[PDB]
Amino acid sequence: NKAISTVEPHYEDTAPAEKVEPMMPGSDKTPKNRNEKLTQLDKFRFAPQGESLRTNQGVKISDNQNSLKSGARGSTLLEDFILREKITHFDHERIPERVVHARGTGAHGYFQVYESLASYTTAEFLQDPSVKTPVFVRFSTVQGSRGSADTVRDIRGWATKFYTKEGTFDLVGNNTPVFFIQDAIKFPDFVHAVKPEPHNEIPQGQSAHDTFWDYISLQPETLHNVMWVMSDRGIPRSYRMMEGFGIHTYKMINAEGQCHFIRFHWKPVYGVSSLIWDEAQLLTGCDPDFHRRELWESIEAGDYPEY
Amino acid sequence: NKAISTVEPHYEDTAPAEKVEPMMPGSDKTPKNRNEKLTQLDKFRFAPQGESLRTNQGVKISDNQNSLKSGARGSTLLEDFILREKITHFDHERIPERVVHARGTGAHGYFQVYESLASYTTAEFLQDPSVKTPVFVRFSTVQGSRGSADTVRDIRGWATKFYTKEGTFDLVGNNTPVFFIQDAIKFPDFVHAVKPEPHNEIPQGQSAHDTFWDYISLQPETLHNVMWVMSDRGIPRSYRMMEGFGIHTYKMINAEGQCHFIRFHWKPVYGVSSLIWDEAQLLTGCDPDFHRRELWESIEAGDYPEYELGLQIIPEEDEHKFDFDILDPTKLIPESLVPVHLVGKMVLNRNPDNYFSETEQVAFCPGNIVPGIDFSDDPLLQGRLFSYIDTQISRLGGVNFHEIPINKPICPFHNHQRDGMHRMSISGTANYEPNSINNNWPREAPPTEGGFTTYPQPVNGYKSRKRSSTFIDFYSQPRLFWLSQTKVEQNHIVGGFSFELGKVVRPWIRERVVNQLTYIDHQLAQSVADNLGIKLSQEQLKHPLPGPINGLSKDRSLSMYDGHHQILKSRQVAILAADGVCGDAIDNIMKTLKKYGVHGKIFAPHVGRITSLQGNEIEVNGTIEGNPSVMVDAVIIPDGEDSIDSLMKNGNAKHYVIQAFKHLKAIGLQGKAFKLYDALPLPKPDEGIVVGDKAADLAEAFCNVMRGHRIWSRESVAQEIAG
Amino acid sequence: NKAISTVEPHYEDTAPAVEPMMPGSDKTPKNRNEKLTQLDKFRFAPQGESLRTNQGVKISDNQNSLKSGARGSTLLEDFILREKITHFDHERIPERVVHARGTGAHGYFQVYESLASYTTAEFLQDPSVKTPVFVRFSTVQGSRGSADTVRDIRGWATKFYTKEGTFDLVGNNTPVFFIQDAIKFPDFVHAVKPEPHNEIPQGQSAHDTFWDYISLQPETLHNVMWVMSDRGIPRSYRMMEGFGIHTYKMINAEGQCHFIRFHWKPVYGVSSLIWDEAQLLTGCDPDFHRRELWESIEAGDYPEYELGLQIIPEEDEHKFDFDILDPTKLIPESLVPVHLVGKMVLNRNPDNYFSETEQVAFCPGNIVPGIDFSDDPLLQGRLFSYIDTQISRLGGVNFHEIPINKPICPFHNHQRDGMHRMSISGTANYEPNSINNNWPREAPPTEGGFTTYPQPVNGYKSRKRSSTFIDFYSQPRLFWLSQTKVEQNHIVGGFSFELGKVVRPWIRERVVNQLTYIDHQLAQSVADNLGIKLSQEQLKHPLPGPINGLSKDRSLSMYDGHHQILKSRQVAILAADGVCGDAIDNIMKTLKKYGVHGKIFAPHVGRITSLQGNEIEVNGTIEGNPSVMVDAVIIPDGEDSIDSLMKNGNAKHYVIQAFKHLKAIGLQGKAFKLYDALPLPKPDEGIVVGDKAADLAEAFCNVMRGHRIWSRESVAQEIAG
Amino acid sequence: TQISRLGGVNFHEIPINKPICPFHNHQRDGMHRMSISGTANYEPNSINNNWPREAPPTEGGFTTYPQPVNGYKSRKRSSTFID
Amino acid sequence: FYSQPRLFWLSQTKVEQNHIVGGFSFELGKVVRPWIRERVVNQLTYIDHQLAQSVADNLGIKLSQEQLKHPLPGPINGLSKDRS
Ligand code: HEM
Ligand code: HEM
Ligand code: HEM
């Protein structure tokens, strides 16, 4: 019988004969969407088709269903290096989540300047419109851990990694033009206040708790961005439909050595739109992955985020 | 200048000088609940009252508001060591989450044995009823990451650490009596399949996706535990209202060397109660911390989680007398065959002071046994014994995690082990055995002196990788489970399969799962097929069904609602009121509810106080907006002309009643409040709708209705209601 | 049956029916301090205790894995075995990236009189307070298994556990460093560390990449001169000086800033090995300095040092011919004298090397109120580095909860979590809060809250070496000119031996070229040793002038400028069976009268028999304790002893070697026969010959006061030993 | 031991440690994951037709030789070792 | 601390202003300690008087005459609201 076969090594095909479309790796769905960075990554990709299942040392595995035992009903033997390698790796899959912005989602793309900005900066990636500068973007919330829901009321992070010829440039901004605090020495204090409270780790994904508003009430410098996050800016409809801001003033230095003060903005081509609070709360219940899913499906459908 | 003063060193008071209750550390709210483990933890606690803010080196900080800069408007200097120490620590706060059961909640308590079990085991913590064994317990889901929601559809994990005098005993279980797979080597496969998918990490806290069901349809050993989690068992109302199971067969050894096969159980004193799926999902939206908050507040309210420890006890010679292998962890032992003997009680009565120090860092492992208990040849259990110590090497930073205060035993623990990261103990004697330079101390302990010995089980066979033929039985117990369910319980099972499969994109996976169901029961298979648009073939409804199990076709204990009790105490009730409410009715409703250990919470259109028609002020627990009906077990609306009319202009308030209705809950209406029920497209009051005018008498009959848990007979008409 | 029992559980006593080195709690429990008392809670006493797993479960059989039969397969269910091996597998943590090789001890510090005039620091306020310390001494290049007596800078880190904070004085045994700006530190270290292809050489700067970097970075030459000198090979950590190097600030209660440089001056004098001797010692006792310090604490010859300060008023910062903020410059004690302000005693060895010495964490950013930083660009980069390194070395940001690292004063703040969090907090984790009335609270400066001295800051954001830093040869020249002639020779010896092991000849010529800018005699001597012809232009390179009218400074010379203490030194007494017993007694009693330790080395261990028939306990064999491990050698009379030693190549070689290492050798009676039979020149001032043992030993002790017979060095180079 | 010495369970991806033959399986993640996987991470699977696949022993899939095992679970030194 | 919050508030449409009011009221309605809600509402009287009143209404907080007369910040370089 074939019930016996399911607990024996599986040497035969499992896909059905015949062989609306599911989310899949970007390599399977958009292999023609290319840039230099993606090409650099190709050499770390696998093609398992036809390949034998192996240990990390390259050793072919004949039986992925059973530990090695003293007989078919016996005690598991310490000499099952295959079991122990398989379980060891699994036991250590996890790495720490980001201390803020733990919950996030990412995509590849490219950046082009419109025309040389040589009047303001020598930055290579801002000189030649013909350059296709690879980017990778991670959108995120702020307060919640990596399993928390997408459509919470929160600031959204927006981090863009520009892989330029003269260096990697990161623009690590948010979806509002200001921040809560003025000096970095207060960041742990502010983060601790907004995070789940230390005794019980409640609440997840929400600033609606005593310690956050205790801090606000005692630190009025926070009122401006609080205004922002209590608006509907704090519940965007999609990462494709929010603005982005470096928040800080930087400096651009041109080839003459003239400095301009500069502030970075992203303006979405698909506009700026938000949920309403009740719908945003209900979405955390029925699709905690909504923004992550939306971005992934939008790219798969050719509704490419453009900013 | 008061705006300026906020950004300057704060040397003055901040609390309001007067100096209902917020949740708090357990030391603040229940200091009188004590045990030996908690006392041990006291040496690591702090009382900052009156203390200077300092660096980790003990240097007093004068100005916690500003970095050190070249001027008030300059660049930050590298020499600001206070800044960097503060930000460094912050930057490295997070440690890896558990690889499974990442989302969890813990509590302290104690266990007591009812009377010595010395006839069955030498286990110290089971020999003396006068002892109070400290415990720590972590409840958890399985699939979600640490920030995922509580009331998902998932197995619940249940880990109890017994701090015994002869060692720390870890009982590491779940809330269903079986597991999905038979051999440890499949565990990463099964977990990878249920976890979010690796390309996009979707979905969170949900088995309703392709890879999980794909694995299921190809590994029919999983069908029994899938049945449990598709049932309402997969959505418990409370960690206090769920059953617990060690799952595996263990051995107990008594002082004469006789061996009994055992299985561990927890039976809740507060009964076994579940949510219904629609309610659970909505609850992930409006309180993702529901279970965790509920456990924390029940302990602060003195509704202490209580559970009885049970043992099924099989003498060694009855091992092969069953119609399944008791070494098979996909099989349960029917309670009608082998009764659960209640041998003790555990009470969780004290919350942690710091969730990370205690709940995040605690480490359980099934390997952590004590003399008197031993392992069986359960091939899942055997592989478990390796993983828990291994995983903790990176989760908790090395091999010294037993020195983290919550993990410390409360008995001595001398050995020759040394070093490792974050070594806290200081050893000044010989680090090898045997030694003569310290007269070979610490010394091996003979068995008659309580030294651990393995029971000399016979071992015969050939080295092999092969599933035991006594294990090839994937369908008999899924059928036993299904036949044991009431019809309402079977419908929720069918609903679980249908909702989950409906999110599976690849049709052939759905087809193959339904196919598996045709080997468990034909009604089950057919009903799931219809919800999925699958026409079953004639041959599939001809698929042979498994026979009975040691004379059993069903087992009442397998059914939640026909087989276990519902308890009123600890439940929550929303009292819907606005300004102008009858003050007397609120008084008498609140008092009647509490007479039965039921908590009434007033929800109004605003927080603070509402004024009664008598002109008295009533403290409000929260807004109706903020506390929707899925958060309570039942709803009551008192009288008051101006309160009822306010609520009839409130879509939230009206939806409260429609939703509570659709979720089969008790609804109590006093006086004019019935005009609010009449205006909704809800039918004539059923047996779970209670109307009257005397508020005390109404509250009494209401409480009596809430004893049914849910109004199941209402399930059919609630399907048409638009909410 | 008895062989059978050795592989069965051990339930019975194994203890049997001068002394070894032991943990401090065993050997000096009466020497205590506040920090040692704090550590007691973490100490264990397994006497009478069962062997147990880490979870508290007693173990019955620590001899066997759980198997499928006595001859079977080991079972995965053996959790006892797997927990034991697992802990073993993860014992090792990363070694320090520099100063990996080190040794630690507890003690205390006392200020002589309040320094309130210059600083508010609490541990410098009250002469009656005993402030606990922990000190780690180290070399710099080698990894943790490398040898003690290499040629290297020595690190010197003192953790003061004060009532208002833990203060770390992280210094070296020389007053300058090799580089000026922290950014160069990884370049310099990579150059000195073993070369990256072959990881050769261990514990030596004598290789191409180090001298390559020296040759391109003349700022390094000052400290190179120190390490090429005999300062690079201290006799003992008890007998070197110590320096914080950087200029720090000291703030008093008025807010007045004094510039400050820290010093340790050893009570036991400043003494060094000689190169050939040092190198041999890495061979026969790679733990020499650790053992000697451990044993000096157990002997009672407790390490003692006086803390010194050079004190410079703020308005004098720019009055020197060098930047006091330049870490390659020292402040000559002839210009700015060192005021001795307090005393450190090291009086307790640890119980567990790993728990205490290995895990201790120092950082120069660990200051306390009353002290502040200067703009020394080396020191500024150091402040970042120490905390950051400890993140991976000690596994996270809670290393301060490791018991050796804990302050003894309170340490409340709002920090939380991190790996292996010991503390359990229950109050508000953010400031400002009201839910806990904002405790813990900021402390006003007048209450001890740390504040930074408001130094002015004027300039432009730039990457530039200060022009006042560009002086590379004047202090090397001053240090050269301050050495005695024997010390200059050993400097020349240091450079020539090291450059001798450089393969690429252009590196050696480039270093010699640098030397021609310091002193022409030095360059010429090194060049001759390396077969290098110096051009005439090189011989004529211009030499720097005096520094604030100074061309020598006596304090820069070990032997002309510092004292040599007889107390605590070690003397080998060579003797076999048949030795004169009264001679030994008389030598011993005399040595002891001056605090010197006599060690009997014999051809076998146990006891030897004297010609008077008495038994004498032996300290070790001659072959096991060669002459490089002692300060001097004495040979008592006794016909059978002498005859035994003359048949012993090692015993004969013991005398030849000690001679060549310029050490005092005492010979009683027939013992001179042994010296006379050897290929040695006639006795000199350091060969004490006598017939009376007591007399001979008194004279022998007097010769030891000189440390070495420097005048012997010329003929020593012709000795075949 | 190598989990802490080499920083986690992907030390096989450090170049000197890499094998020179293929090595597909369903392991994933862990600290410093270099390789980028894009197929099903569980076995059995149907969405990628169960590749990578177990290999029959006659194809070179590892197998333990079926040595007989007979004894009692016990911690004991074999008498034949006592020499 | 208040000019830019006020500038943000006055640049919002009426709907957007109501949603901002809902944000504070919903969030502050899960705050258990009453003095925290009252202090937050007290900060809002330095931003806009209506905003403070609408939110204090939803929290059962009676504003005082002293509070309802709290000074409001002036325009920002002539600007009182910005469409962006
Ligand atoms: C100007 C306001 C700030 C903005 C807009 C901002 C933005 C972000 C964003 C978007 C991320 C997530 C990057 C990712 O996807 O991986 C992030 C991470 C982080 N930020 Fe901030 N941040 C700000 C302020 C701060 C401050 C003051 C600190 C503390 C000094 C801080 C520390 C961090 C840390 C530690 C992370 C985690 C980085 C990682 O693990 O990779 N940020 N920030
Ligand atoms: C009998 C079926 C099993 C049950 C009932 C069970 C139960 C649990 C529970 C309750 C936890 C969470 C404990 C806590 O921290 O609160 C847990 C964690 C874990 N289990 Fe299982 N498990 C089972 C099977 C397995 C298997 C087969 C493996 C793999 C060998 C495994 C590996 C793990 C690991 C690695 C953890 C995380 C431990 C940690 O991080 O501390 N379990 N299990
Ligand atoms: C005046 C120059 C310096 C002196 C006197 C000095 C002294 C020392 C000493 C004595 C130690 C060993 C401490 C112990 O026993 O644990 C040490 C360690 C160390 N130093 Fe330096 N150092 C100097 C310059 C530097 C610089 C420029 C850096 C790099 C910025 C640096 C980085 C380190 C590091 C990373 C350690 C290892 C710390 C640890 O692992 O605990 N130091 N230093």
Tab-separated table of N, CA, C and O and ligand atoms in Angstrom, chain C residues 96-99 136 155-157 170-172 177 185 245-246 362 378 381-382 385-386 389-390 393, ligand 3:
chain	number	residue	atom	x	y	z
C	96	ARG	N	41.613	38.660	24.005
C	96	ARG	CA	41.695	40.089	23.721
C	96	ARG	C	42.477	40.301	22.430
C	96	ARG	O	43.398	39.539	22.122
C	97	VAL	N	42.049	41.292	21.630
C	97	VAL	CA	42.658	41.504	20.318
C	97	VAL	C	44.105	41.989	20.480
C	97	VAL	O	44.955	41.721	19.630
C	98	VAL	N	44.397	42.705	21.563
C	98	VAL	CA	45.755	42.981	22.008
C	98	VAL	C	45.819	42.694	23.504
C	98	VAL	O	44.799	42.604	24.188
C	99	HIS	N	47.035	42.495	24.009
C	99	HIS	CA	47.218	42.107	25.410
C	99	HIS	C	46.464	40.819	25.766
C	99	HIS	O	46.022	40.648	26.900
C	136	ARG	N	45.365	43.829	35.984
C	136	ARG	CA	45.835	42.831	35.032
C	136	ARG	C	47.115	43.334	34.368
C	136	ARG	O	47.124	44.422	33.798
C	155	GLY	N	51.422	45.678	29.289
C	155	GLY	CA	50.231	46.406	29.668
C	155	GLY	C	50.024	46.379	31.166
C	155	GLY	O	50.452	45.453	31.852
C	156	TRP	N	49.360	47.418	31.684
C	156	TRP	CA	49.189	47.560	33.136
C	156	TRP	C	47.840	48.227	33.388
C	156	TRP	O	47.733	49.458	33.316
C	157	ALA	N	46.825	47.421	33.713
C	157	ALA	CA	45.458	47.902	33.840
C	157	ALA	C	44.980	47.738	35.278
C	157	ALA	O	44.955	46.620	35.804
C	170	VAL	N	44.167	52.416	32.510
C	170	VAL	CA	44.663	51.417	31.570
C	170	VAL	C	45.978	51.943	30.988
C	170	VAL	O	45.989	52.720	30.033
C	171	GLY	N	47.103	51.539	31.560
C	171	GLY	CA	48.373	52.019	31.032
C	171	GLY	C	49.344	50.945	30.579
C	171	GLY	O	48.990	49.765	30.525
C	172	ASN	N	50.587	51.349	30.294
C	172	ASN	CA	51.671	50.480	29.847
C	172	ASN	C	52.875	50.682	30.766
C	172	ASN	O	52.868	51.539	31.658
C	177	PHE	N	53.619	56.180	23.727
C	177	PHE	CA	53.125	55.156	22.816
C	177	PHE	C	53.743	55.328	21.427
C	177	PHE	O	54.364	56.349	21.119
C	185	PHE	N	46.031	52.804	14.872
C	185	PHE	CA	46.190	51.639	15.743
C	185	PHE	C	46.083	50.310	15.007
C	185	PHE	O	46.977	49.468	15.187
C	245	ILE	N	50.180	57.341	30.276
C	245	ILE	CA	50.683	57.903	29.019
C	245	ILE	C	49.980	59.203	28.635
C	245	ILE	O	50.635	60.246	28.465
C	246	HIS	N	48.659	59.156	28.497
C	246	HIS	CA	47.897	60.324	28.082
C	246	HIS	C	47.851	61.389	29.162
C	246	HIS	O	47.915	61.114	30.362
C	362	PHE	N	38.414	46.295	31.109
C	362	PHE	CA	38.912	47.635	31.399
C	362	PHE	C	38.578	48.560	30.235
C	362	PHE	O	38.548	48.142	29.080
C	378	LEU	N	45.085	60.081	20.329
C	378	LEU	CA	45.148	58.657	20.651
C	378	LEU	C	44.076	58.292	21.673
C	378	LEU	O	43.238	57.402	21.435
C	381	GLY	N	40.359	58.186	20.502
C	381	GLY	CA	39.975	56.965	19.808
C	381	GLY	C	39.894	55.759	20.724
C	381	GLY	O	39.088	54.851	20.493
C	382	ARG	N	40.705	55.738	21.786
C	382	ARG	CA	40.650	54.632	22.737
C	382	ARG	C	39.304	54.561	23.433
C	382	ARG	O	38.845	53.469	23.766
C	385	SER	N	36.862	52.312	21.838
C	385	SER	CA	37.268	50.991	21.407
C	385	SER	C	37.003	49.931	22.464
C	385	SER	O	36.583	48.819	22.121
C	386	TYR	N	37.270	50.261	23.727
C	386	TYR	CA	37.211	49.269	24.794
C	386	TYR	C	35.815	48.695	25.014
C	386	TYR	O	35.650	47.488	24.946
C	389	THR	N	34.798	46.428	21.815
C	389	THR	CA	35.468	45.128	21.721
C	389	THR	C	34.863	44.133	22.661
C	389	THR	O	34.722	42.985	22.322
C	390	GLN	N	34.511	44.591	23.838
C	390	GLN	CA	33.939	43.727	24.832
C	390	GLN	C	32.566	43.187	24.462
C	390	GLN	O	32.136	42.207	25.028
C	393	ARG	N	33.855	40.007	22.799
C	393	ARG	CA	34.738	39.233	23.663
C	393	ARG	C	33.972	38.595	24.819
C	393	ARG	O	34.198	37.422	25.148
F	3	HEM	C1	48.490	54.814	25.116
F	3	HEM	C2	48.197	53.819	24.327
F	3	HEM	C3	47.537	52.635	24.838
F	3	HEM	C4	47.730	51.982	25.989
F	3	HEM	C5	48.685	52.316	27.082
F	3	HEM	C6	46.843	50.888	25.973
F	3	HEM	C7	46.760	49.947	26.989
F	3	HEM	C8	46.045	48.792	26.955
F	3	HEM	C9	46.099	47.763	27.875
F	3	HEM	C10	46.978	47.695	29.067
F	3	HEM	C11	45.218	46.830	27.505
F	3	HEM	C12	44.948	45.532	28.216
F	3	HEM	C13	43.856	45.633	29.272
F	3	HEM	C14	43.530	44.339	29.968
F	3	HEM	O1	44.292	43.777	30.697
F	3	HEM	O2	42.464	43.820	29.831
F	3	HEM	C15	44.616	47.286	26.336
F	3	HEM	C16	43.629	46.627	25.659
F	3	HEM	C17	43.071	47.141	24.527
F	3	HEM	N1	43.215	48.301	23.859
F	3	HEM	FE1	44.698	49.582	24.318
F	3	HEM	N2	46.161	50.893	24.787
F	3	HEM	C18	46.515	51.896	24.125
F	3	HEM	C19	46.049	52.272	22.891
F	3	HEM	C20	45.016	51.695	22.251
F	3	HEM	C21	44.418	52.144	21.088
F	3	HEM	C22	44.778	53.318	20.246
F	3	HEM	C23	43.428	51.277	20.831
F	3	HEM	C24	42.523	51.329	19.713
F	3	HEM	C25	41.751	52.353	19.555
F	3	HEM	C26	43.407	50.344	21.836
F	3	HEM	C27	42.530	49.324	21.907
F	3	HEM	C28	42.587	48.338	22.861
F	3	HEM	C29	41.713	47.194	22.797
F	3	HEM	C30	40.671	46.909	21.786
F	3	HEM	C31	42.010	46.446	23.837
F	3	HEM	C32	41.368	45.168	24.224
F	3	HEM	C33	40.371	45.517	25.297
F	3	HEM	C34	39.695	44.292	25.798
F	3	HEM	O3	39.509	43.336	25.100
F	3	HEM	O4	39.350	44.196	26.922
F	3	HEM	N3	44.273	50.716	22.716
F	3	HEM	N4	45.122	48.585	26.005
